[PDB]
Amino acid sequence: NDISLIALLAFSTLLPFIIASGTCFVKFSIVFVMVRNALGLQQIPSNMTLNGVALLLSMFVMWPIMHDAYVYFEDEDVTFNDISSLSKHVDEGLDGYRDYLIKYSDRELVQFFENAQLKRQYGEETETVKRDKDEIEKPSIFALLPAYALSEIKSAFKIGFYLYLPFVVVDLVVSSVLLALGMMMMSPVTISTPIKLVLFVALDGWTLLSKGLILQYMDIA
């Protein structure tokens, strides 16, 4: 009973590195550094605030998942009478986070870590597990979030290539119209920077990409 408080404070201290790895903050942060880099701006818009705007959307999506943990764990009947039922209770408490990892992680990248951990565990003689586990068996919580964080780096770079495209189509035609004249000794990025800013403010990519990311996890009406 007293050491349940030790387990609470020890969970409390390791919290922001879980937000650093486990949640979807890793999708917003990467694509927001990429929209800064593709525009050519280096310091602005001062990424200390870009962490904050990327954090607030991730909290805005993560709130219904984390809220059921409070109502499940502030129950007055946490304490059971058997040692295996009490260890069963924290599993069925952790299942709402765990199937969230299942929905948004990759299939084979998760599947690679169980085979890699078992041959470390017993030895080479352990036979490999295939895709067909998926209908009944659940993986561990420590074999998911590596393959989760790699799959989300894959999806964030998937998004980051696409809106990198409409700026380099601008950056090649400016470097060609300057060489249509004899203006070879001229820095084309200082002419390219206004029409790079117009193609983002006339298109208004912030207020439709921000809706796009919330549509990639949740729905409306």
Binding site: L9, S12, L15, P16, F17, A20, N51, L55
Partner: peptide, 10 residues
Amino acid sequence: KGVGAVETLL
């Protein structure tokens, strides 16, 4: 710990 956790990310 709550206000320090947001501090370490921002």
